[PDB]
Scaffold this motif. Sequence first.
Motif, PDB file in Angstrom:
ATOM      1  N   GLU A   9       0.833  -1.205   0.000  1.00 50.31           N
ATOM      2  CA  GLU A   9       0.000   0.000   0.000  1.00 50.31           C
ATOM      3  C   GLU A   9       0.859   1.244   0.000  1.00 50.31           C
ATOM      4  O   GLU A   9       0.588   2.214  -0.709  1.00 50.31           O
ATOM      5  CB  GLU A   9      -0.967  -0.004   1.173  1.00 50.31           C
ATOM      6  N   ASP A  10       1.919   1.180   0.763  1.00 46.08           N
ATOM      7  CA  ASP A  10       2.906   2.219   0.780  1.00 46.08           C
ATOM      8  C   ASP A  10       4.213   1.576   0.437  1.00 46.08           C
ATOM      9  O   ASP A  10       4.424   0.400   0.726  1.00 46.08           O
ATOM     10  CB  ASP A  10       3.019   2.907   2.135  1.00 46.08           C
ATOM     11  N   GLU A  11       5.075   2.342  -0.158  1.00 48.29           N
ATOM     12  CA  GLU A  11       6.356   1.858  -0.621  1.00 48.29           C
ATOM     13  C   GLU A  11       7.112   1.289   0.561  1.00 48.29           C
ATOM     14  O   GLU A  11       7.891   0.346   0.437  1.00 48.29           O
ATOM     15  CB  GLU A  11       7.137   3.016  -1.223  1.00 48.29           C
ATOM     16  N   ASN A  12       6.832   1.871   1.716  1.00 52.18           N
ATOM     17  CA  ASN A  12       7.426   1.432   2.961  1.00 52.18           C
ATOM     18  C   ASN A  12       6.365   0.838   3.897  1.00 52.18           C
ATOM     19  O   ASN A  12       6.466   0.948   5.116  1.00 52.18           O
ATOM     20  CB  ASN A  12       8.166   2.585   3.625  1.00 52.18           C
ATOM     21  N   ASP A  13       5.318   0.220   3.336  1.00 48.56           N
ATOM     22  CA  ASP A  13       4.441  -0.598   4.166  1.00 48.56           C
ATOM     23  C   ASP A  13       5.063  -1.970   4.258  1.00 48.56           C
ATOM     24  O   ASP A  13       6.200  -2.127   4.698  1.00 48.56           O
ATOM     25  CB  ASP A  13       3.012  -0.750   3.601  1.00 48.56           C
ATOM     26  N   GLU A  14       4.316  -2.954   3.828  1.00 47.27           N
ATOM     27  CA  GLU A  14       4.836  -4.292   3.686  1.00 47.27           C
ATOM     28  C   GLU A  14       4.677  -4.775   2.251  1.00 47.27           C
ATOM     29  O   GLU A  14       3.621  -5.288   1.879  1.00 47.27           O
ATOM     30  CB  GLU A  14       4.130  -5.225   4.647  1.00 47.27           C
ATOM     31  N   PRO A  15       5.702  -4.585   1.407  1.00 46.76           N
ATOM     32  CA  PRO A  15       5.687  -5.094   0.042  1.00 46.76           C
ATOM     33  C   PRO A  15       5.736  -6.613   0.026  1.00 46.76           C
ATOM     34  O   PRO A  15       6.489  -7.237   0.776  1.00 46.76           O
ATOM     35  CB  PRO A  15       6.931  -4.494  -0.588  1.00 46.76           C
ATOM     36  N   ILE A  16       4.918  -7.192  -0.816  1.00 48.53           N
ATOM     37  CA  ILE A  16       4.676  -8.618  -0.804  1.00 48.53           C
ATOM     38  C   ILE A  16       4.853  -9.225  -2.190  1.00 48.53           C
ATOM     39  O   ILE A  16       4.518  -8.596  -3.192  1.00 48.53           O
ATOM     40  CB  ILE A  16       3.264  -8.921  -0.284  1.00 48.53           C
ATOM     41  N   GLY A  37      -4.516  -2.823  -3.015  1.00 50.93           N
ATOM     42  CA  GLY A  37      -4.301  -1.988  -4.192  1.00 50.93           C
ATOM     43  C   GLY A  37      -5.586  -1.849  -4.966  1.00 50.93           C
ATOM     44  O   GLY A  37      -5.739  -0.976  -5.807  1.00 50.93           O
ATOM     45  N   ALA A  38      -6.504  -2.733  -4.630  1.00 52.75           N
ATOM     46  CA  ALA A  38      -7.879  -2.718  -5.089  1.00 52.75           C
ATOM     47  C   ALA A  38      -8.032  -2.506  -6.589  1.00 52.75           C
ATOM     48  O   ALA A  38      -7.996  -3.457  -7.363  1.00 52.75           O
ATOM     49  CB  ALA A  38      -8.662  -1.678  -4.322  1.00 52.75           C
ATOM     50  N   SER A  39      -8.156  -1.256  -6.991  1.00 50.95           N
ATOM     51  CA  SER A  39      -8.632  -0.931  -8.319  1.00 50.95           C
ATOM     52  C   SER A  39      -7.711   0.078  -8.974  1.00 50.95           C
ATOM     53  O   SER A  39      -7.987   0.589 -10.060  1.00 50.95           O
ATOM     54  CB  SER A  39     -10.050  -0.383  -8.215  1.00 50.95           C
ATOM     55  N   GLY A  40      -6.615   0.356  -8.305  1.00 52.54           N
ATOM     56  CA  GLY A  40      -5.684   1.331  -8.792  1.00 52.54           C
ATOM     57  C   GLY A  40      -4.281   0.939  -8.473  1.00 52.54           C
ATOM     58  O   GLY A  40      -4.028   0.321  -7.440  1.00 52.54           O
ATOM     59  N   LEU A  41      -3.348   1.289  -9.316  1.00 51.31           N
ATOM     60  CA  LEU A  41      -1.993   0.960  -9.001  1.00 51.31           C
ATOM     61  C   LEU A  41      -1.066   2.138  -9.084  1.00 51.31           C
ATOM     62  O   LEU A  41      -1.314   3.124  -9.775  1.00 51.31           O
ATOM     63  CB  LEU A  41      -1.439  -0.152  -9.893  1.00 51.31           C
ATOM     64  N   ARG A  42      -0.026   2.017  -8.302  1.00 53.15           N
ATOM     65  CA  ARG A  42       1.205   2.744  -8.495  1.00 53.15           C
ATOM     66  C   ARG A  42       2.296   1.731  -8.273  1.00 53.15           C
ATOM     67  O   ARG A  42       1.995   0.645  -7.800  1.00 53.15           O
ATOM     68  CB  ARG A  42       1.346   3.875  -7.517  1.00 53.15           C
ATOM     69  N   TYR A  43       3.518   1.993  -8.660  1.00 51.42           N
ATOM     70  CA  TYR A  43       4.594   1.123  -8.228  1.00 51.42           C
ATOM     71  C   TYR A  43       5.931   1.813  -8.237  1.00 51.42           C
ATOM     72  O   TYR A  43       6.081   2.878  -8.842  1.00 51.42           O
ATOM     73  CB  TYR A  43       4.613  -0.169  -9.035  1.00 51.42           C
ATOM     74  N   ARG A  44       6.880   1.204  -7.548  1.00 51.10           N
ATOM     75  CA  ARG A  44       8.204   1.751  -7.416  1.00 51.10           C
ATOM     76  C   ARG A  44       9.278   0.900  -8.080  1.00 51.10           C
ATOM     77  O   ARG A  44       9.296  -0.333  -7.918  1.00 51.10           O
ATOM     78  CB  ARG A  44       8.560   1.962  -5.946  1.00 51.10           C
ATOM     79  N   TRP A  68       8.310  -5.144 -17.397  1.00 49.50           N
ATOM     80  CA  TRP A  68       9.047  -5.296 -16.174  1.00 49.50           C
ATOM     81  C   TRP A  68       8.575  -6.523 -15.417  1.00 49.50           C
ATOM     82  O   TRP A  68       9.193  -7.581 -15.489  1.00 49.50           O
ATOM     83  CB  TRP A  68       8.870  -4.034 -15.346  1.00 49.50           C
ATOM     84  N   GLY A  69       7.482  -6.374 -14.690  1.00 51.20           N
ATOM     85  CA  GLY A  69       6.858  -7.528 -14.100  1.00 51.20           C
ATOM     86  C   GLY A  69       6.321  -7.312 -12.725  1.00 51.20           C
ATOM     87  O   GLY A  69       5.115  -7.220 -12.512  1.00 51.20           O
ATOM     88  N   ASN A  70       7.235  -7.172 -11.804  1.00 45.70           N
ATOM     89  CA  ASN A  70       6.963  -7.529 -10.428  1.00 45.70           C
ATOM     90  C   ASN A  70       7.572  -6.515  -9.514  1.00 45.70           C
ATOM     91  O   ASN A  70       8.057  -6.807  -8.422  1.00 45.70           O
ATOM     92  CB  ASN A  70       7.479  -8.933 -10.141  1.00 45.70           C
ATOM     93  N   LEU A  71       7.554  -5.318 -10.026  1.00 43.85           N
ATOM     94  CA  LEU A  71       7.863  -4.122  -9.292  1.00 43.85           C
ATOM     95  C   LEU A  71       7.107  -4.121  -8.022  1.00 43.85           C
ATOM     96  O   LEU A  71       6.103  -4.820  -7.877  1.00 43.85           O
ATOM     97  CB  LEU A  71       7.427  -2.888 -10.078  1.00 43.85           C
ATOM     98  N   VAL A  72       7.568  -3.304  -7.132  1.00 39.63           N
ATOM     99  CA  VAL A  72       6.925  -3.176  -5.866  1.00 39.63           C
ATOM    100  C   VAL A  72       5.831  -2.157  -6.022  1.00 39.63           C
ATOM    101  O   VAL A  72       6.080  -0.957  -6.161  1.00 39.63           O
ATOM    102  CB  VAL A  72       7.933  -2.771  -4.811  1.00 39.63           C
ATOM    103  N   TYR A  73       4.618  -2.632  -6.046  1.00 45.18           N
ATOM    104  CA  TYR A  73       3.516  -1.770  -6.327  1.00 45.18           C
ATOM    105  C   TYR A  73       3.153  -0.947  -5.133  1.00 45.18           C
ATOM    106  O   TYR A  73       3.307  -1.366  -3.997  1.00 45.18           O
ATOM    107  CB  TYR A  73       2.298  -2.570  -6.745  1.00 45.18           C
ATOM    108  N   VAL A  74       2.736   0.253  -5.426  1.00 50.39           N
ATOM    109  CA  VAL A  74       2.134   1.125  -4.464  1.00 50.39           C
ATOM    110  C   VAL A  74       0.612   1.005  -4.603  1.00 50.39           C
ATOM    111  O   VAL A  74       0.110   0.747  -5.696  1.00 50.39           O
ATOM    112  CB  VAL A  74       2.630   2.549  -4.730  1.00 50.39           C
ATOM    113  N   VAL A  75      -0.126   1.211  -3.526  1.00 53.15           N
ATOM    114  CA  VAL A  75      -1.526   0.807  -3.497  1.00 53.15           C
ATOM    115  C   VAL A  75      -2.471   2.002  -3.550  1.00 53.15           C
ATOM    116  O   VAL A  75      -2.456   2.876  -2.681  1.00 53.15           O
ATOM    117  CB  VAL A  75      -1.838  -0.107  -2.286  1.00 53.15           C
ATOM    118  N   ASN A  76      -3.268   2.032  -4.612  1.00 58.97           N
ATOM    119  CA  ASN A  76      -4.174   3.138  -4.883  1.00 58.97           C
ATOM    120  C   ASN A  76      -5.599   2.624  -5.115  1.00 58.97           C
ATOM    121  O   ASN A  76      -5.800   1.702  -5.885  1.00 58.97           O
ATOM    122  CB  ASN A  76      -3.655   3.846  -6.135  1.00 58.97           C
ATOM    123  N   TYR A  77      -6.578   3.199  -4.444  1.00 58.36           N
ATOM    124  CA  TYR A  77      -7.980   2.926  -4.746  1.00 58.36           C
ATOM    125  C   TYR A  77      -8.864   4.088  -4.313  1.00 58.36           C
ATOM    126  O   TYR A  77      -9.940   3.838  -3.731  1.00 58.36           O
ATOM    127  CB  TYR A  77      -8.470   1.645  -4.093  1.00 58.36           C
TER     128      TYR A  77
END
Length: 77
Positions: A9-16, A37-44, A68-77
């Motif tokens: 959800e946050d770049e510094n939450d818990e990326p999974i 991340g529901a219905s929206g994405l961001r990623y780092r 890319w693939g499997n970036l660490v997504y940031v969570v937006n909804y």
Amino acid sequence: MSEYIRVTEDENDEPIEIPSEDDGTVLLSTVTAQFPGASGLRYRNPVSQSMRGVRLVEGILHAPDAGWGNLVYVVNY
């Protein structure tokens, strides 16, 4: 041969690390059945380190064909 993606959800939450469908696709709506991340994405980062979002098509969340693939997504909804 298991391609997966990274989300938090946050770049510094818990990326999974989580597995995805071979199409590079995932059940977006089925994903939103929670706080994922529901219905929206961001990623780092593994792209341009740009907070950019993931494709949503007809209820699907799609990654690029071979981008890319499997970036660490940031969570937006």
